Structure 1
Amino acid sequence: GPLGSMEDFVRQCFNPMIVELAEKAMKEYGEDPKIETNKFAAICTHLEVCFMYSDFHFIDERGESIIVESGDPNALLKHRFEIIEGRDRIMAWTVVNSICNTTGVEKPKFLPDLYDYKENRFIEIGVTRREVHIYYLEKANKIKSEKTHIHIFSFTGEEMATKADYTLDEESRARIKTRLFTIRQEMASRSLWDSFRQSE
């Protein structure tokens, strides 16, 4: 039917915290969310995936990996992931250096998205409107010598991850995929999707 505004969609369908972090990210790099609107939506989408990836995952009081969906994360539990994406450059490198100097893991060349304290590795999260294998390769090309694990989601439910190691259980990955499908369906109802797919 009528064509919506991608700005309206972003502000309506993403949490304000996410929108704000994305606006700040874009300003930091000199890009205007009112102009690069498809990019704004992609940035919000990727941030949300990063948050959803780490949601509910802890390392227990005996120090192994568990899921707690209660809003009461009893205080002896360690969050399983450190989130790097969404931080400004200075803070992001501060966090990365701290992890590296601590855990002994090697320092990445570019900022990754997450650190996994269970698997003891950085993770790069991809979100793509294209074939996952193509985007996997591109990401890998920048990471090169790689201790950094890559995990790619598409909007159609396909995934590709380093060494066929998917890190998370099926239910967690299913939440992310359901959210991506919902984003695509909603863009489509506002006639925003075609343009957004093509602009990656």
Structure 2
Amino acid sequence: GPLGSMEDFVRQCFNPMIVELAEKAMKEYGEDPKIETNKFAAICTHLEVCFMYSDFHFIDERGESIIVESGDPNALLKHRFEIIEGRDRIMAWTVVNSICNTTGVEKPKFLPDLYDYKENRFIEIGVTRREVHIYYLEKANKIKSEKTHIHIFSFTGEEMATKADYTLDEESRARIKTRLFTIRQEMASRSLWDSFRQSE
């Protein structure tokens, strides 16, 4: 079939909020979304996974973790996760440092992606086009804070997480895996997938 452009794919398949946050982060780090196009799509994918991991997860009046998929959560409900990724570096560290001084959790070396108020830990999310164990070790070796929990998703449905602790229920992780499958299938229909996979 015809080869599409990754630019077109990104603009058509991701929410404009995600796209804009991704462009901003690439510029903050000196990379151009119109040149590092596979990376642009990967950043959008990862940021969407971070949002989707957080989506619908609250802590209720009693203090228990619950899932609320309707648009209207009860007003006493608190988001279960803090989202770090997507913020610029000053704001991301502002949020991190705050969590740390409050909850007593130590400060990590690098910016993580989320904070889980139920499990009381930072989370690093990984999304990979390669074997999950390989990518797991890369992230583990990089941060080595050893309090930050790591959760890796691949595009073919495999997952790996610290201490075989997957944090979320099967249905939540299934939403993420379905979305990843969709991204891959659509990239493939546009003849973008092989290259995107190989560029990681």
What TM-score results when the alignment is normalised by the length of structure 2?
A: 0.99
CA distance in 2, matches of 1:105, 1:179: 32
CA distance in 1, matches of 2:60, 2:176: 23
**Do residues 59 (structure 1) and 94 (structure 2) align?**
no
Render the CA deviation track for 1:106-160: whole Å, top value 9, x for unaligned.
1000000000000000000000000000000000001214100000000000000
CA distance in 1, matches of 2:145, 2:175: 31
Contact 2:155 2:181 in 1 (8 A): yes
Note the C-alpha offset of 1:90.
Answer: 0.2
CA distance in 2, matches of 1:119, 1:59: 11
CA distance in 2, matches of 1:196, 1:132: 17
Alignment of 1:1-200 (within 5 A): 1-200=1-200
Note the C-alpha offset of 1:7.
Answer: 0.2
Note the C-alpha offset of 1:73.
Answer: 1.2
Structure 1 stretches of 4+ moved >2 Å: none
CA distance in 1, matches of 2:77, 2:68: 10
CA distance in 2, matches of 1:15, 1:48: 9
- SS of residue matched to 1:115: strand
Note the C-alpha offset of 1:67.
Answer: 0.2
Specify every segment of 5 or more residues in structure 2 that has no aligned partner in the other structure, as ranges.
Answer: none
Render the CA deviation track for 1:167-197: whole Å, top value 9, x for unaligned.
0000000000000000000000000000000
> Alignment length, in residue pairs?
200
Identity, % of aligned positions: 100
CA distance in 2, matches of 1:64, 1:51: 21
Higher alpha-carbon deviation: 137-146 or 149-158: 137-146
CA distance in 2, matches of 1:12, 1:50: 19
Higher alpha-carbon deviation: 112-121 or 143-152: 143-152
CA distance in 1, matches of 2:22, 2:33: 9
Render the CA deviation track for 1:32-79: whole Å, top value 9, x for unaligned.
000000000000000000000000000000001000001001110010
- SS of residue matched to 1:62: coil
CA distance in 2, matches of 1:70, 1:105: 32
The alignment's C-alpha RMSD in Å is: 0.4
CA distance in 2, matches of 1:64, 1:70: 18
Higher alpha-carbon deviation: 89-98 or 144-153: 144-153
CA distance in 2, matches of 1:50, 1:187: 20
Higher alpha-carbon deviation: 139-148 or 97-106: 139-148
